[PDB]
């Protein structure tokens, strides 16, 4: 199942240990492999002690729907992953945020859902997990260790996030109007005005393809083309020491700017390497992150590099007839 980007699943020794704010790119990626970011999210917004993902790491997270394409590429970023990298924010849920039907919420400590205007996460505190409906947290006699397995984390949707090419407002408004034309029946998505109706139906599950282009709200689509392009930027490479683990911020910068480290076929072509020197020792090696590339989306006569893209369940109100 997938596998980790750099760091194998954590074996935490203390639920009370602090989470260190790391600056290196590969340092942050390592924390992402070990679900340190979801644990940080749980401690912040829910008053939860410890970690999730013991021995499992990010690769053993559970998904809705369970069969997930982007799950198989360890290098594709979930909304939580991009949040840790500061590309977006997964907000704490409020009572108004609609919990969607279909996921198996029972025994889950955290779950996350992309909404029409953002990304929302639901947490549980120490000693508790979600009921069957997801509406509440209830006492869970298996969670008091504070060192919980990965499948207690639920990521809803088949999602890939990346560095976007920002687009001007004119592009977004045109993209906005095309989506309105493709979905004339819809009124509100996740409580946010999509069209003007006055005549709405009750909220209803809505599996839709969308994309984040870094504006007011997302852009949902029916007919679109997706293409994966390769870009070989430094963010496509992670650097590790054999034995030590992820390289520091300064060692990673040196590797990616000075052709002084070792790497695989792709890394040496991009930034350069040097062999014939390596004694016993151990310096930093940088390898390619396993992904199809960057996703580029054609829609409504346009073509964008979006912040996020995927097919996920949102809630929609329809036109009354």
């Amino acid at each position, epitope marked *: 199942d997938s596998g980790p980007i750099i760091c194998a699943g954590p074996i935490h020794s203390n639920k009370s240990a602090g989470i260190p704010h790391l600056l290196g790119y590969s340092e942050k990626i390592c924390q992402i492999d070990r679900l340190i970011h979801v644990s940080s999210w749980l401690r912040n917004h829910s008053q939860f002690q410890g970690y999730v993902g013991q021995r499992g790491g990010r690769s053993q997270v559970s998904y809705y729907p369970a069969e997930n394409s982007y799950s198989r590429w360890s290098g594709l970023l979930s909304p939580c992953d991009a949040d840790w990298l500061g590309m977006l924010v997964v907000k704490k849920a409020r009572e108004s945020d609609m919990i969607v039907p279909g996921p198996s919420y029972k025994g889950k400590v955290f779950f996350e859902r992309p909404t029409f205007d953002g990304y929302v996460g639901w947490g549980c505190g120490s000693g508790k997990s979600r009921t069957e409906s997801g509406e509440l947290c209830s006492s869970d006699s298996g969670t*008091s260790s504070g060192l919980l397995p990965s499948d207690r984390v639920l990521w809803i949707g088949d999602v890939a996030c990346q560095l976007m090419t920002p687009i001007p407002e004119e592009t977004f408004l045109e993209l906005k109007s095309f989506s309105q034309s493709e979905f004339p029946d819809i009124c509100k998505i996740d409580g946010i005005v999509f069209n003007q109706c006055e005549g709405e139906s009750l909220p209803q599950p809505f599996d839709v393809a969308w994309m984040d282009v870094g504006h007011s709200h997302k852009i949902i689509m029916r007919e679109h083309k997706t293409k994966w392009v390769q870009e070989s930027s430094s963010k496509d490479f992670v650097c590790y020491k054999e*034995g030590t683990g992820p390289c520091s911020e300064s060692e990673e910068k040196a590797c990616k700017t000075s052709g002084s480290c070792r790497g695989d076929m792709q890394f040496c072509k991009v930034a350069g390497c040097e062999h014939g020197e390596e004694t016993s020792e151990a310096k930093c090696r940088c390898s390619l992150v396993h992904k199809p590339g960057e996703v580029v989306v054609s829609y409504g006569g346009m073509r964008v590099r979006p912040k996020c893209y995927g097919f996920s369940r949102m809630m929609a109100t329809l036109h009354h007839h």
Partner: antibody
Amino acid sequence: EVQLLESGGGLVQPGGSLRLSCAASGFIFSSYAMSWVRQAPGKGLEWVSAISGSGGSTYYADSVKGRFTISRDNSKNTLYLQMNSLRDEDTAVYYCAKDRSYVSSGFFDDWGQGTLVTVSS
Amino acid sequence: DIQMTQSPSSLSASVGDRVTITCQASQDISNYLNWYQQRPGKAPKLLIFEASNLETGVPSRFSGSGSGTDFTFTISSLQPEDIATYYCQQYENLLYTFGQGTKLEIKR
């Protein structure tokens, strides 16, 4: 506060079977993985088996796989080890141990007093 | 799978002296090594976890270090109650394995 009390050891002839019990108190049994570790007379420590907090994951050393079974009753707060097809290399003091996590992790933070199993005719 | 070796097998030192025990793994286990003390007639007791962390209540004269395959357990100043056999244990793999043990005699 945390205490583990083994019982069920004794004489058994080769090919025989035994069930060991380990009664737990002073902690939330169902939240923690448990392990069995044994020690032959005059020898070192040998990890035998482990089980997750709920019992959905079991693990065994190759020396005992297929002959031993680990289980737990989280309402009675006791841990079990069913040992079948016993041999002379199984003669040892058997300890139960409390782990630090729901998932088997390998921190043997609390130990029972041990119970002796002797395999001879 | 992962085999653990301890040296020395036996060791004699007197009170106030420094004691160092080594433990090696056949593969990388990062810092996933624990140290146990088994006093005569008693069950083993966890002294250090994650190769360097003192368990609660363990005196500061106990210490450990190492990452990868080579590890060390140190008693800075021997005390008579330290008479025991000391075991290292890897937990990188779920199938946990112990070292063979180091027996510590107290000279007097």
